[PDB]
Amino acid sequence: TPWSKSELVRQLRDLGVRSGDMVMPHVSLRAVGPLADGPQTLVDALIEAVGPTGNILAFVSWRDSPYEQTLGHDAPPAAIAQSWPAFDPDHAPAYPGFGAINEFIRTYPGCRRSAHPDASMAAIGPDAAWLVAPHEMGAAYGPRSPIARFLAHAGKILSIGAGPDAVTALHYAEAVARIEGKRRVTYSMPLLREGKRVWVTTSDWDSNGILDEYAAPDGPDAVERIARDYLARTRVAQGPVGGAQSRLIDAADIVSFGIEWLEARHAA
Numbered sequence: 001t002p003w004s005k006s007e008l009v010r011q012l013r014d015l016g017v018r019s020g021d022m023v024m025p026h027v028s029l030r031a032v033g034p035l036a037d038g039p040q041t042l043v044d045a046l047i048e049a050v051g052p053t054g055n056i057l058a059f060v061s062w063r064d065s066p067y068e069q070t071l072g073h074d075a076p077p078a079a080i081a082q083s084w085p086a087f088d089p090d091h092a093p094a095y096p097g098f099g100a101i102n103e104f105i106r107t108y109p110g111c112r113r114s115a116h117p118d119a120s121m122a123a124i125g126p127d128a129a130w131l132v133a134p135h136e137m138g139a140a141y142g143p144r145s146p147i148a149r150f151l152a153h154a155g156k157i158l159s160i161g162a163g164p165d166a167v168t169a170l171h172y173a174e175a176v177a178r179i180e181g182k183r184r185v186t187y188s189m190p191l192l193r194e195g196k197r198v199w200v201t202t203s204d205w206d207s208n209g210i211l212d213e214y215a216a217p218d219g220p221d222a223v224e225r226i227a228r229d230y231l232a233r234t235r236v237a238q239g240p241v242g243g244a245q246s247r248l249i250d251a252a253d254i255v256s257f258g259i260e261w262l263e264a265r266h267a268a
């Protein structure tokens with residue numbers, strides 16, 4: 001029988017989600033199983049679990065981000081530049097590969113959306129505006145991003161059947177790690193500025209592998225290696241949400257662990 005909102009809420013409470021919490025979910029809907037009213041059932045349950053003073057932050061990105069199409073170029077290629085849609089935060093759909101739940105999160109009434117087209121973050125709750133801005137090109141997951149503020153806001157990472165590769169917040173550790181050989185990428189995004197499309201070219205840390213040895217197309221990247229180690233070494237509440245094995249992780253703690261992990265392994 002499909003899971004009801006009430007059942008999910010009680011499961012989230014059992015796992016340790018409390019009213020007022022700041023939660024970043026990573027969800028495998030296949031692992032969760034059938035829901036009474038589809039993915040919205042779990043969105044509603046998350047909102048109810050954090051309560052009217054809690055907050056949700058999700059890494060939603062953009063279905064049509066021209067990342068691969070502009071990667072490595074000092075300017076968007078001519079055909080891309082001419083016709084690509086500008087990122088419109090009110091209308092741009094989420095990137096399906098980070099989870100089908102994210103399109104439901106970002107369309108929730110009152111959801112706020114960050115301005116970085118490729119790293120776009122969605123937030124629901126009283127602190128949503130403070131979470132989502134600024135989010136500038138060149139600051140995807142590191143200092144000054146919504147992840148940085150989440151990590152300062154008692155954030156908890158709620159992994160619902162998702163693997164250790166899924167922990168976006170660990171890209172902050174990569175950004176700040178004092179290690180040699182860090183990979184950077186250059187790409188271009190089309191933004192709206194006073195109603196007009198403006199192409200912005202930037203560089204940032206490579207979110208597909210911070211060092212060469214972490215950059216194989218099919219991983220494991222450093223996020224995955226850090227998170228697997230962390231979960232083998234740390235008490236973390238575990239339990240079901242729907243049919244999915246889930247975990248509730250202190251975000252500041254895993255990020256600090258990840259900074260230390262990288263700096264212990266790689267010369268400065």
Ligand SMILES: CN[C@@H]1[C@@H](O)[C@@H](O[C@@H]2[C@@H](O)[C@H](O[C@H]3O[C@H](CN)CC[C@H]3N)[C@@H](N)C[C@H]2N)OC[C@]1(C)O
Nearest residue numbers: 061062065067068095118165207208209217219221
């Ligand atoms: C939406 N554009 C995205 C772009 O943001 C980026 O996405 C990466 C994504 O590939 C990474 O994750 C992906 O690759 C990992 C191995 N490198 C394993 C997990 C897999 N989801 C995330 N950890 C960080 C995102 N910014 O590279 C892929 C892409 C599709 O172009």
Ligand SMILES: [Mg+2]
Nearest residue numbers: 053054126127
């Ligand atoms: Mg508050």
